[PDB]
Amino acid sequence: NAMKIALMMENSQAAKNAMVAGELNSVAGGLGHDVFNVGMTDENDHHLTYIHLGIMASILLNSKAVDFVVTGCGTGQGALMSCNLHPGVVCGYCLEPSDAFLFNQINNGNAISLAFAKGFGWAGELNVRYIFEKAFTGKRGEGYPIERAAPQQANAAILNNVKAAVAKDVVEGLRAIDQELVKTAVGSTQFQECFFAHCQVPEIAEYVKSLL
Amino acid sequence: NAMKIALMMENSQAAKNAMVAGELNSVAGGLGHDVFNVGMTDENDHHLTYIHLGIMASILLNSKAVDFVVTGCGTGQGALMSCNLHPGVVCGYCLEPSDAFLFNQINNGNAISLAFAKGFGWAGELNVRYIFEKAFTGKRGEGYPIERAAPQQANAAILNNVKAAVAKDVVEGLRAIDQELVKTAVGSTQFQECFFAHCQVPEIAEYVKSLL
Amino acid sequence: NAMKIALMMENSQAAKNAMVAGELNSVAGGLGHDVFNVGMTDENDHHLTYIHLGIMASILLNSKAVDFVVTGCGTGQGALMSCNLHPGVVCGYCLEPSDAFLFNQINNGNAISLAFAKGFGWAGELNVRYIFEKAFTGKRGEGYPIERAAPQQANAAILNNVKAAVAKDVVEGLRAIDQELVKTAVGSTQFQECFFAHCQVPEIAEYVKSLL
Amino acid sequence: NAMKIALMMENSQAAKNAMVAGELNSVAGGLGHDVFNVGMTDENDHHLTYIHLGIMASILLNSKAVDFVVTGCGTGQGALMSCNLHPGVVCGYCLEPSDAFLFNQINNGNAISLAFAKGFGWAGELNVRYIFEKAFTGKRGEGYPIERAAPQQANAAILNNVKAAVAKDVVEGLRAIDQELVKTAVGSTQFQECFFAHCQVPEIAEYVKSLL
Numbered sequence: 001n002a003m004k005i006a007l008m009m010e011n012s013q014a015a016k017n018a019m020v021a022g023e024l025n026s027v028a029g030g031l032g033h034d035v036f037n038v039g040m041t042d043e044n045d046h047h048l049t050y051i052h053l054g055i056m057a058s059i060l061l062n063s064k065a066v067d068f069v070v071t072g073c074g075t076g077q078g079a080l081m082s083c084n085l086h087p088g089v090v091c092g093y094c095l096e097p098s099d100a101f102l103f104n105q106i107n108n109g110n111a112i113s114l115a116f117a118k119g120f121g122w123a124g125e126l127n128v129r130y131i132f133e134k135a136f137t138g139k140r141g142e143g144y145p146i147e148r149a150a151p152q153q154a155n156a157a158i159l160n161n162v163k164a165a166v167a168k169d170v171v172e173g174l175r176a177i178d179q180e181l182v183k184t185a186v187g188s189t190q191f192q193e194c195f196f197a198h199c200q201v202p203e204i205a206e207y208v209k210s211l212l
Numbered sequence: 213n214a215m216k217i218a219l220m221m222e223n224s225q226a227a228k229n230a231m232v233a234g235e236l237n238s239v240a241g242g243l244g245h246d247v248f249n250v251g252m253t254d255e256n257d258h259h260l261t262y263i264h265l266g267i268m269a270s271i272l273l274n275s276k277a278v279d280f281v282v283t284g285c286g287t288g289q290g291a292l293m294s295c296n297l298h299p300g301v302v303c304g305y306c307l308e309p310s311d312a313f314l315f316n317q318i319n320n321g322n323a324i325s326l327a328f329a330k331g332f333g334w335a336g337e338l339n340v341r342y343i344f345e346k347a348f349t350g351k352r353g354e355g356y357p358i359e360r361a362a363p364q365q366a367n368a369a370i371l372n373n374v375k376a377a378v379a380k381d382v383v384e385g386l387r388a389i390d391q392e393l394v395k396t397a398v399g400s401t402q403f404q405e406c407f408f409a410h411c412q413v414p415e416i417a418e419y420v421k422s423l424l
Numbered sequence: 425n426a427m428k429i430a431l432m433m434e435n436s437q438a439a440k441n442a443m444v445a446g447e448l449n450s451v452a453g454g455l456g457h458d459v460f461n462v463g464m465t466d467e468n469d470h471h472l473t474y475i476h477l478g479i480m481a482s483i484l485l486n487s488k489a490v491d492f493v494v495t496g497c498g499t500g501q502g503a504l505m506s507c508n509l510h511p512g513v514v515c516g517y518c519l520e521p522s523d524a525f526l527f528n529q530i531n532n533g534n535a536i537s538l539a540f541a542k543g544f545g546w547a548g549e550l551n552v553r554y555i556f557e558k559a560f561t562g563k564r565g566e567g568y569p570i571e572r573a574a575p576q577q578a579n580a581a582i583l584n585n586v587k588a589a590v591a592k593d594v595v596e597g598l599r600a601i602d603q604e605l606v607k608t609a610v611g612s613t614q615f616q617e618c619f620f621a622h623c624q625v626p627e628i629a630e631y632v633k634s635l636l
Numbered sequence: 637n638a639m640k641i642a643l644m645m646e647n648s649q650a651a652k653n654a655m656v657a658g659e660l661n662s663v664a665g666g667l668g669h670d671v672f673n674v675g676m677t678d679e680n681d682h683h684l685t686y687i688h689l690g691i692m693a694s695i696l697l698n699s700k701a702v703d704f705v706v707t708g709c710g711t712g713q714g715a716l717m718s719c720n721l722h723p724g725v726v727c728g729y730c731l732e733p734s735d736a737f738l739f740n741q742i743n744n745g746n747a748i749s750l751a752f753a754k755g756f757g758w759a760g761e762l763n764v765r766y767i768f769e770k771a772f773t774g775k776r777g778e779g780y781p782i783e784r785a786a787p788q789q790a791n792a793a794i795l796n797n798v799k800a801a802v803a804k805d806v807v808e809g810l811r812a813i814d815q816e817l818v819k820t821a822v823g824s825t826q827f828q829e830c831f832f833a834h835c836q837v838p839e840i841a842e843y844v845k846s847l848l
Contacts, residue, residue, distance in 0.1 A: 049363075051370050074546055075311070077304045077319050078367060084296035085375045092289045093305045096732055098762040099287070102330065107289050118314065121548070122498055122541035123780065126734040130766070144759065151261075155290060158263050158393070163297045165388035167378055176377035181370070286758055308520055310550040333760070334710055334753035335568065338522040342554070356547065473787075475794050499735070501728045501743050502791060508720035509799045516713045517729045523711070526754065531713050542738065575685075579714060582687050582817070587721045589812035590803055600801035605794070 001139065002032045003067035006060050006194060008039030010048045012074050013116040017041050019125055020116070024070060027132035036066065036194040046188040054082030054089070055177065055185040057111055059208065062088040062170050065198035070132075072114035080113035087167035090159065095119065096127065100135035101144075106152050107159075108141035171207050183211045213351065214244045215279035218272050218406060220251030222260045224286050225328040229253050231337055232328070236282060239344035248278065248406040258400040266294030266301070267389065267397040269323055271420065274300040274382050277410035282344075284326035292325035299379035302371065307331065308339065312347035313356075318364050319371075320353035383419050395423045425563065426456045427491035430484050430618060432463030434472045436498050437540040441465050443549055444540070448494060451556035460490065460618040470612040478506030478513070479601065479609040481535055483632065486512040486594050489622035494556075496538035504537035511591035514583065519543065520551065524559035525568075530576050531583075532565035595631050607635045637775065638668045639703035642696050642830060644675030646684045648710050649752040653677050655761055656752070660706060663768035672702065672830040682824040690718030690725070691813065691821040693747055695844065698724040698806050701834035706768075708750035716749035723803035726795065731755065732763065736771035737780075742788050743795075744777035807843050819847045 007024050009017045021037045028035050038056065040048050048056075050073045057069045069091070073079045076093055083091035090109030094100050103109060112135060114128065141156070143149020167173055174182055186192065186208050199205045219236050221229045233249045240247050250268065252260050260268075262285045269281045281303070285291045288305055295303035302321030306312050315321060324347060326340065353368070355361020379385055386394055398404065398420050411417045431448050433441045445461045452459050462480065464472050472480075474497045481493045493515070497503045500517055507515035514533030518524050527533060536559060538552065565580070567573020591597055598606055610616065610632050623629045643660050645653045657673045664671050674692065676684050684692075686709045693705045705727070709715045712729055719727035726745030730736050739745060748771060750764065777792070779785020803809055810818055822828065822844050835841045 049367050049370075051367055051374060054374070075314055075318065077315060077321075078371070080292070081296050081302055081304065081319070081321070082371060082374070084293050085299075085371075085378055087297075087378075090293055092293065095307070096763075097766055098330075098759060101762060102287055102759055103289060106287065107293070109289075109293070115545075117546035118310075119543055119545050121539075121544040123734060123738055124545070126737060127732075130733055130770075134766075155261050155263055158261075158390075159290070159294060159297075162263060162266070162294070162389055162393070165390070166297055166299075166380060166385040168380055173378040177374055178370075178377070181374070308551075309554055310547060313550060314547055327757075329758035331755055332757040333751075333755050335522060335526055336757070338525060339520075342521055342558075346554075473791050473794075475791055475798060478798070499738055499742065501739060501745075502795070504716070505720050505726055505728065505743070505745070506795060506798070508717050509723075509795075509802055511721075511802075514717055516717065519731070522754075526711055527713060530711065531717070533713075533717070542734075579685050579687055582685075582814075583714070583718060583721075586687060586690070586718070586813055586817070589814070590721055590723075590809040592802060592804055597802040601798055602794075602801070605798070 002034070004034045004036065004065070004198060005068045005070060005136070006036045006038045006066040007070045008053050008056055009071065010040060010050050010053055010073055010079070011043065013072065014040040014043045014045065016116050020128055023125060023129045024132055027129060028136045031136050033136055038188070038191045038194050039071070041190070048184070050078035050082045051181060052185040053079050054086055055174070055182055056191060057083045057089050057091070058086035058170070058174070059186065059204060060195060061110055062201065063195065063204040064200040065195050067110065069111035070114070071111060072116050074115065074117035076113040076115040083111050083113065087163045087170060087173070094131055094135070097130040097134040100131050104135065104140040105142050105144040108156050171203055174207065179211070186211055214246070216246045216248065216277070216410060217280045217282060217348070218248045218250045218278040219282045220265050220268055221283065222252060222262050222265055222285055222291070223255065225284065226252040226255045226257065228328050232340055235337060235341045236344055239341060240348045243348050245348055250400070250403045250406050251283070253402070260396070262290035262294045263393060264397040265291050266298055267386070267394055268403060269295045269301050269303070270298035270382070270386070271398065271416060272407060273322055274413065275407065275416040276412040277407050279322065281323035282326070283323060284328050286327065286329035288325040288327040295323050295325065299375045299382060299385070306343055306347070309342040309346040312343050316347065316352040317354050317356040320368050383415055386419065391423070398423055426458070428458045428460065428489070428622060429492045429494060429560070430460045430462045430490040431494045432477050432480055433495065434464060434474050434477055434497055434503070435467065437496065438464040438467045438469065440540050444552055447549060447553045448556055451553060452560045455560050457560055462612070462615045462618050463495070465614070472608070474502035474506045475605060476609040477503050478510055479598070479606055480615060481507045481513050481515070482510035482594070482598070483610065483628060484619060485534055486625065487619065487628040488624040489619050491534065493535035494538070495535060496540050498539065498541035500537040500539040507535050507537065511587045511594060511597070518555055518559070521554040521558040524555050528559065528564040529566050529568040532580050595627055598631065603635070610635055638670070640670045640672065640701070640834060641704045641706060641772070642672045642674045642702040643706045644689050644692055645707065646676060646686050646689055646709055646715070647679065649708065650676040650679045650681065652752050656764055659761060659765045660768055663765060664772045667772050669772055674824070674827045674830050675707070677826070684820070686714035686718045687817060688821040689715050690722055691810070691818055692827060693719045693725050693727070694722035694806070694810070695822065695840060696831060697746055698837065699831065699840040700836040701831050703746065705747035706750070707747060708752050710751065710753035712749040712751040719747050719749065723799045723806060723809070730767055730771070733766040733770040736767050740771065740776040741778050741780040744792050807839055810843065815847070822847055
């Protein structure tokens with residue numbers, strides 16, 4: 001059940017990346033997962049907004065470089081909406097531990113967006129830890145409850161179809177985005193190291209290479 | 213500041229539509245908005261899933277038939293992810309009243325997705341009411357706080373561009389969806405009555421007509 | 425329906441008193457209530473802990489100097505448990521707006537304890553505002569729902585009896601507390617100004633005077 | 637670190653006792669604790685309100701029959717306020733898992749009150765489980781963070797003193813309560829079985845015996 005998980009954070013919450021990466025590495029690493037911290041590591045790092053996060057999630061998930069994305073922003077809204085526009089990226093909100101469990105069972109998506117500022121106060125790091133505990137333990141997509149899994153599974157499958165239909169082909173779509181945005185998205189050493197090491201889709205690798 | 217607002221709910225939460233429509237009509241109607249209840253009205257109504265909800269939100273928002281969509285499902289996740297894939301549909305989560313305020317100020321989107329089952333217990337209707345109070349009172353897109361509105365406004369604008377770039381043209385995209393899904397989405401009398409009365413985009417009207 | 429409301433905060437959250445008093449004065453003042461800020465006003469003010477808060481709530485409520493107490497601490501737990509030990513002080517938690525409404529209708533108590541650190545992040549002041557909006561608007565003790573008010577009202581009445589039975593008489597009890605604690609509790613100018621101006625119970629006034 | 641834990645629920649939430657006892661037995665039992673279900677087991681059981689719950693918590697905690705109480709009601713407010721009036725009973729609210737952890741570290745009390753109706757919807761049992769996981773794993777009273785434990789520990793100690801001072805002696809206080817209430821509180825077979833088997837304070841046992 002082990003996955004490659006990419007953590008990616010943007011400028012408004014970058015000061016908190018060390019804390020979140022700490023919890024993710026502790027929890028998900030302890031559970032046997034392979035964790036990559038590909039967004040901002042602090043406020044002085046290669047600058048990103050929640051727009052770049054969505055593009056990064058698409059490139060990493062669609063190229064199969066990673067299996068799951070952890071992201072977020074002050075409220076999680078920008079990052080969640082920025083991820084979900086991309087085909088192949090199915091991102092839920094995650095505000096408290098049972099969100100993560102239900103998301104995995106009902107939606108069986110591949111990204112979650114946390115709120116790192118709103119609702120995040122003294123002792124907020126505990127909730128992040130507990131979210132990771134429930135997100136990355138156990139099996140995924142069994143429905144909840146297990147007996148009612150059929151229509152949930154059916155609709156989750158259809159969601160992927162609709163996303164693929166409404167969207168251009170992945171690379172064509174990326175080419176239509178302002179290329180300044182995409183260049184910025186793939187610009188950091190930590191992003192490139194993850195992507196190039198694990199990309200399973202040559203067309204995406206070649207496209208990314210052409211930007212650098 | 214008055215808008216046309218469409219409420220749209222799917223089968224799992226359809227029993228609760230009367231309650232939610234009640235609160236929406238009371239709150240938003242009292243504030244001078246024009247409310248349309250275009251999804252399921254009860255469990256026996258024209259059957260919809262959260263997949264159809266997203267298609268309905270796209271058709272109504274992109275045709276300018278309505279200005280804002282209220283939707284949701286058991287956790288809000290399926291409906292939120294189903295809406296956000298569509299160009300022109302910018303849907304936030306909304307779980308408690310300050311979510312609605314912040315969404316309007318920071319993201320300035322045009323749809324919210326509520327959780328009608330998870331976290332919804334005895335006295336849940338109060339929270340729905342209060343959410344509507346904050347969603348539909350006052351101005352939108354001023355940033356929060358007001359002084360920091362610049363980058364938030366800039367990123368919200370870019371989000372729309374990226375959505376438009378990654379997605380096919382609206383009608384082409386709708387044609388690529390399984391047409392059974394789209395026919396179902398536009399199938400009800402309450403949907404058609406809202407759409408045909410208020411659609412401002414002939415190409416969409418003609419496409420919808422061709423399905424009926 | 426107008427009341428005298430005392431806001432009282434302790435050292436760990438004292439930096440936030442200006443914000444909370446601001447919202448309370450704005451909301452409750454606008455609704456015609458008389459607001460007193462009797463706890464710490466900032467970190468440098470006459471020093472209090474959540475222990476002193478409970479004693480202050482007892483003296484002000486039992487002397488009828490005020491009708492309602494707003495208090496809290498990092499999580500609200502210490503202040504809530506410190507208030508509830510005292511006869512005549514019925515303090516609920518209040519974390520989000522519908523808590524305040526339900527508390528007023530079901531429990532019909534006279535104090536609420538907020539969390540000013542845990543769960544309090546960027547945009548936390550909005551939730552405080554909204555809590556005050558629901559706490560101090562409308563009528564109290566009607567049950568919720570209104571039709572089921574009978575057993576709720578009966579039990580709320582009994583709670584007061586049990587508190588009065590288990591506790592010593594008010595003044596005797598205050599005399600049994602470490603008198604250093606009580607002297608500290610009544611020590612500030614803002615506390616004394618409220619108490620002495622509005623106390624309706626001479627025995628309590630005389631006892632308080634004897635400490636000063 | 638093993639404790640004796642009493643679960644006690646009242647009439648409004650009695651239908652949910654099987655679920656809660658299930659989770660408590662699973663979680664706390666698995667962690668080596670000894671669990672007693674001493675309140676209502678279903679809607680037809682020996683009838684209790686949240687008033688009786690507080691009296692039961694006092695008798696069981698003050699007699700040292702148990703180490704910890706799990707209780708609650710629709711919102712948790714009545715049960716929390718009913719417990720906290722009694723000397724020797726230090727009851728926090730518990731609505732989500734990190735509440736339980738912080739309560740144990742900061743307040744180091746001996747009871748928690750959950751909300752079984754408000755905020756409790758589809759998937760609510762997961763949150764109950766997770767709450768028990770955090771309440772009953774690990775050590776208690778270390779402060780949070782650990783480095784800042786001194787004033788938190790000092791104030792928690794003082795809280796006990798103030799409670800003991802304001803309250804009559806335990807048995808005298810129980811005698812002052814309407815004795816119908818106390819007779820009802822100790823009336824069930826499941827309560828008596830726990831109490832008489834584990835009571836370490838003869839005066840309390842003799843008093844309880846005199847009611848039966």
